[PDB]
């Protein structure tokens, strides 16, 4: 009940930990390939189920101790998707795009740490003012993973299109060049 909210507490702070160390990899240069379509769409979806996830923690601190432990319980295996996705999608990203690598990963960071607050404010408001702050912190980080999710996929496109681009340029300077 509040125990569910106190173990989601402990969950919730190792993530971040692997977080953590996931952005010293990428700062590093050392975070390779092992597509970002793929995750993107992965993230994306999980995104939006924490946003639901928020809306009903915030429903279970007026309702039952089963009610209150089901929200910690979902909201907790719904930010380990979202923390696996996100390094999945920087991993593929690749060590050329170290900038981008890093802020994706940091936006979900910010999601787990803003998601921790939250089920504390919960489990303490089962105060009233601590969590409704929370409960809009989350959903405007979430909001800002969003926007970097869109920032670091339009990048990468636009890198690949340009790479495409010098490729064929260089060619068409040999063909200009052979004439």
Same mark, same amino acid.
């Given at each position: 009940g +509040?125990? @569910?909210c106190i173990n989601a507490a402990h969950t919730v702070s190792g993530i971040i930990g692997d977080l953590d160390t996931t952005i010293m990899f990428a700062t590093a240069g050392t975070l390779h390939s092992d597509s970002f379509? !793929?995750?993107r769409e992965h993230i994306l979806q999980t995104a939006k189920a924490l946003v639901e996830d928020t809306k009903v923690l915030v429903t =279970?601190? @007026?309702g039952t101790q089963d009610q209150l @432990?089901?929200?910690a319980q979902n909201a907790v295996s719904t930010i380990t998707q979202? @923390?696996?996705a996100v390094k999945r999608g920087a991993? %593929?990203? =690749? %060590? +050329?795009q170290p900038d %981008?690598?890093?802020m994706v990963i940091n936006a979900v960071k910010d999601v787990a740490s803003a998601l921790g607050d939250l089920i504390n404010c919960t489990k303490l408001a089962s105060s009233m003012q601590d969590l409704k702050e929370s409960a809009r912190v989350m959903v405007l980080n979430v909001s800002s993973l969003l926007k970097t999710v869109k920032a670091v996929? !339009?990048?990468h496109t636009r890198g690949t299109r340009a790479m495409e681009a010098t490729v064929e340029a260089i060619s068409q300077e040999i063909r200009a060049l052979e004439h």
């Open positions: +509040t125990q @569910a379509a !793929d995750h =279970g601190a @007026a @432990a089901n929200a979202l @923390a696996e991993c %593929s990203l =690749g %060590s +050329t %981008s690598q890093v996929e !339009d990048e």
